[PDB]
Design a protein around this ligand. Sequence first.
Ligand SMILES: O[C@@H]1[C@@H](O)[C@H](O[C@@H]2CO[C@@H](O[C@@H]3CO[C@@H](O)[C@H](O)[C@H]3O)[C@H](O)[C@H]2O)OC[C@H]1O
Length: 328
Amino acid sequence: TVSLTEKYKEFFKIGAAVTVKDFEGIHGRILTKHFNSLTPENDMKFERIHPKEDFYNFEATDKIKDFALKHNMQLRGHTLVWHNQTPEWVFRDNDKEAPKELVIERLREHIKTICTRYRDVVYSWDVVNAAVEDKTDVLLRDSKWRRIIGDDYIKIAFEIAKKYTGNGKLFYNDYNNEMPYKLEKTYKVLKSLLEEGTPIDGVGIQAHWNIWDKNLIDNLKRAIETYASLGLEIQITELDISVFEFEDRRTDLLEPTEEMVELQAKVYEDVFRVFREYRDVITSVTLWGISDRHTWKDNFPVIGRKDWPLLFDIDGKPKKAFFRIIDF
Ligand SMILES: O[C@@H]1[C@@H](O)[C@H](O[C@@H]2CO[C@@H](O[C@@H]3CO[C@@H](O)[C@H](O)[C@H]3O)[C@H](O)[C@H]2O)OC[C@H]1O
């Protein structure tokens, strides 16, 4: 039995990425059993919730909020400002590109609207997502947000959100931010935000991981400690552990191999022991899905294959990895 949220009740919240259909059937039972935190996988993203300037779509996010309230769960607000899944209208002023202040004013109104509607159920917001340049050694990714608003756009987004979020915690969220090159760069960016009076409460470590990273444990321990030194909360926001190396695009596997299944268990053990070790600084751990039945990893980075990245298998049964992380 041993629901995960209960077992971890004194350590951190235990979360899952969700859509409306996940409240039904076997997924719905896993959630209410094991999880006390929910993140809308897509429905709170700008393109989905606010597809045209004069049109918001609240149906899905309202349903997610309601389900959470009815089951004593809370939400992570994902995400306000991101270079992906953001509609082009935001950056257009008719036939011209939109200037800095117009984009800021649209952002103001978007954040006001979304944060006002969900502030009562959201405990943490991903205010800015994946703003740190992941490839080159320039600090900031060069998105339309970053280009048009300018160098201060992260502070600007955080100051706006702080108006409407109450006691919700404000997070900067990103991937690969446990890796040495990106850790150093992210640390720099966050340290400077804080010295500028940015109301940032913590860092999201997305944790889109895989079984073959022999550097992960050392990388994770470092990162957690490095971010903690800035006085930031830590949340593991989108945990999954792929059986493939990122650039292994093989499409042949119908199932995980024995070495893969067992290596995954060890890595889940290793990461969750690290999560448990840093219980004082980690406030939430969310997995990017419930079971291997629905995972974005089936279409990223390769359209139309299968991955087995989560704690519950395609049938909905707890994997040996599950029982490892609850043996404590
Ligand atoms: O065709 C579109 C799909 O590609 C899209 O898939 C979603 C893409 O976002 C995924 O979540 C992100 C993973 O990366 C992190 O850095 C971000 O923080 C996450 O938001 C999500 O899991 C996929 O479903 O869905 C919409 C389609 O139109």
